[PDB]
């Protein structure tokens, strides 16, 4: 598992992101549009989106992101105790919105590259490979989900 030194890591970094989420879900998103484009062909509501200024303009992108790190971090802290939160998050991004499992190994390395950018003396290479770590965990629940669903990956 994780230590509880490793997630100390993890959440004390988490705690900076809480501070403005709205700005670190919209620069995440952005991330993940721009270095994976198929990612973005996923989000009927989003498809329309051509440059990086029109991503940064709207409203309803950055509301998204909200709503991706909100439900990140109620995961992030149960600390690995998160069964009841990721059950409905995988069976609507397996059944309803088909999202590859590798698409969220995208999405944690958009994560990991922006938490980089905002907070360099704060997130050493210590906390890289904890943050890494709690993500790979993330993706190995969602993904032993996904198979017995029958969508692995
Ligand atoms: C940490 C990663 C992710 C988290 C925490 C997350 C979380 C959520 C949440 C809470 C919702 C709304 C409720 C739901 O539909 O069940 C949602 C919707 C959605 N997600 Fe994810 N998601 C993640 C990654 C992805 C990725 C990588 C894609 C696509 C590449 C994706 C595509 C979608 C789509 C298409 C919707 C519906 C948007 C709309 O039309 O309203 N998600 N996600």
Do not use: C
């Amino acid at each position: 598992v994780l230590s509880e030194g490793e997630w100390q890591l993890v959440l004390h970094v988490w705690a900076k992101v809480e501070a403005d989420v709205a700005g670190h879900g919209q620069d995440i998103l952005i991330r993940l549009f721009k270095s994976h484009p198929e990612t973005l062909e996923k989000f009927d509501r989003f498809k329309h989106l051509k440059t990086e200024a029109e991503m940064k303009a709207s409203e309803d992108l950055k509301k998204h992101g909200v709503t991706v790190l909100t439900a990140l971090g109620a995961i992030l802290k149960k600390k690995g105790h998160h069964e009841a939160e990721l059950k409905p998050l995988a069976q609507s991004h397996a059944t309803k919105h088909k999202i590859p499992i590798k698409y969220l190994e995208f999405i944690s390395e958009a994560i990991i590259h922006v938490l980089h950018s905002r907070h360099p003396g704060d997130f050493g290479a210590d906390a890289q490979g904890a943050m890494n770590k709690a993500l790979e965990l993330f993706r190995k629940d969602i993904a032993a989900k996904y198979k017995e669903l029958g969508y692995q990956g």
